[PDB]
Ligand binder design. Structure first.
Ligand SMILES: NC[C@@H]1O[C@H](O[C@H]2[C@@H](O)[C@H](O[C@@H]3[C@@H](O)[C@H](N)C[C@H](N)[C@H]3O[C@H]3O[C@H](CN)[C@@H](O)[C@H](O)[C@H]3N)O[C@@H]2CO)[C@H](N)[C@@H](O)[C@@H]1O
Ligand SMILES: NC[C@@H]1O[C@H](O[C@H]2[C@@H](O)[C@H](O[C@@H]3[C@@H](O)[C@H](N)C[C@H](N)[C@H]3O[C@H]3O[C@H](CN)[C@@H](O)[C@H](O)[C@H]3N)O[C@@H]2CO)[C@H](N)[C@@H](O)[C@@H]1O
Ligand SMILES: [Ca+2]
Ligand SMILES: [Mg+2]
Ligand SMILES: [Mg+2]
Lengths: 253, 252
């Protein structure tokens, strides 16, 4: 297994339509729609891309996937009932900016009743409260946790964790920015480059990303300073924008 | 401006206050309460958060309370026994990161040996599950990463390479942890513990040195090291019998 290998878009689409034929052969009238998502769905796949497809099923409670390799390429096909997919499309978790670009990258190749259009409309019409709640949760569940981890590093080590943690913090900052601006990053590789181009960044986030994007992560004192500055920028930014969590109670239940 | 420095004794006070609140609020529906994580192992440092698990009798109970006081952070998970036992016996790609919870339990209340039963379940998972998880990890994560850094080599962007290299090193540490059936103690010790194990795939220790030192700016050296680690994976998995099925063009 020396793959993945170089492939053309033409070769990838040939594979997509073979999979389409197998899906229709196997599930027949239970198939509501089939779409390609990811880079191939946007027709911006590069030489080494994977193949990602989604199938809307009529079967109640259908929720399964097939993910496999031939050693030279890899495919993931998800199968969901319409109800399960629409619910997923309207839930906003802390990694919504990483997961839900699926619904903005759909290339329908089969659709028996506007089903993929419905999916897109549901994904693009999520209410503002869900993004507000997800941002407040991200601050508590991830950012506050990371601050404790790098502050522990400052006092007791290990600095060998600091480069990885710094990457994690920059990624969480990109989720914060993506939820706030309601943007779904196009690829894994474009998360940080797209995050730092957005407007109204928390102070210190740009600088933190500069270390991560340059790969210059060996100066622990500079990183800890940049992390603290970003944590300060977070505090100012969330109160400016009203992402306020009541922290007054020792036990809030 | 938190989290702040706290002592182990201050954290244990908080834990017992939460225990009292849980028993007042839920009463006889509480089967057991435990602390896990660094505090459960009694190795918490100055800034650690507090993590607790409850076993509930209510069928389908599955919720959590996670909050900060501005100064410290707590997460309390509430699960039925059946939901928790099921979770404790499922082996995903990140089992070495997640299931140390079950080897870190400090019991503080237990009406019927429930925490011990959860621990026994977690420690007795079938070997085949780890095999399946490793084969899944190779396909679903490592093969994906290889395509991503090979795309970087030919079309950029190299600004993704340090973050991607960190991801690959972490995925290699999951592979090692699944193989040796070990749950890393903390986020921070994953890579130092992974590279101390025996039977490392070739190229893995070298790759991790870039990640641990933070020397992630030489893109050609990183790409060469990823390729060597990817080669090392192929020899290693074949040697240990983690054979990925590549025979089907469409496997359904
Ligand atoms: N509690 C047992 C089981 O937990 C599962 O969820 C697991 C996982 O998704 C979930 O992850 C939750 C998130 O969700 C939530 N949004 C933030 C929270 N900090 C995080 O917590 C988890 O991840 C952290 C690292 N990031 C760890 O530090 C932490 O100890 C761990 N409990 O925690 C669970 C593992 O502890 C299922 N809910 C269910 O099978 C069952 O209830
Ligand atoms: N399909 C719609 C919904 O997806 C959910 O799960 C989501 C998520 O956990 C799941 O993640 C799956 C994993 O599990 C599986 N073990 C490896 C697989 N490559 C991964 O795939 C996901 O993460 C990858 C990045 N590493 C992305 O490249 C990929 O596009 C994305 N589908 O993909 C789903 C997003 O597509 C639920 N299954 C369900 O609510 C519903 O089916
Ligand atoms: Ca025990
Ligand atoms: Mg946590
Ligand atoms: Mg994937």
């Amino acid at each position: 297994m020396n793959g993945p290998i170089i492939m053309t878009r033409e070769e990838r689409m040939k594979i997509v339509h073979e999979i389409k034929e197998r899906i229709l052969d196997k599930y027949g009238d239970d198939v509501k729609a089939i779409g390609v998502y990811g880079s191939l769905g946007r027709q911006t796949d590069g030489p080494y891309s994977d193949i990602e497809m989604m199938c809307v099923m009529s079967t109640e409670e259908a929720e399964f996937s097939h993910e496999w390799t031939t050693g030279e390429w890899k495919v993931e096909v998800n199968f969901d009932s319409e109800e399960i997919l629409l619910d997923y499309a309207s839930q906003v978790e802390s990694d919504w900016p990483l997961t839900h670009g699926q619904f903005f990258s759909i290339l329908p190749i089969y659709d028996s009743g506007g089903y993929l259009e419905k999916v897109y409309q549901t994904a693009k019409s999520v209410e503002a409260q869900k993004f507000h709640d997800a941002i407040c949760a991200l601050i508590v569940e991830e950012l506050f946790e990371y601050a404790g981890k790098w502050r522990n590093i400052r006092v007791q080590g290990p600095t060998t964790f600091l480069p990885s943690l710094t990457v994690q913090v920059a990624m969480a900052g990109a989720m914060l920015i993506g939820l706030h601006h309601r943007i779904c990053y196009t690829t894994s590789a474009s998360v940080l480059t797209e995050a730092v181009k957005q407007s109204d960044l928390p102070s210190g986030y740009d600088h933190l990303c500069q270390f991560v994007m340059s790969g210059q992560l060996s100066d622990s004192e500079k990183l800890l300073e940049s992390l603290e500055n970003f944590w300060n920028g977070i505090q100012e930014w969330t109160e400016r924008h009203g992402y306020i969590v009541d922290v007054s109670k020792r036990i809030p239940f």
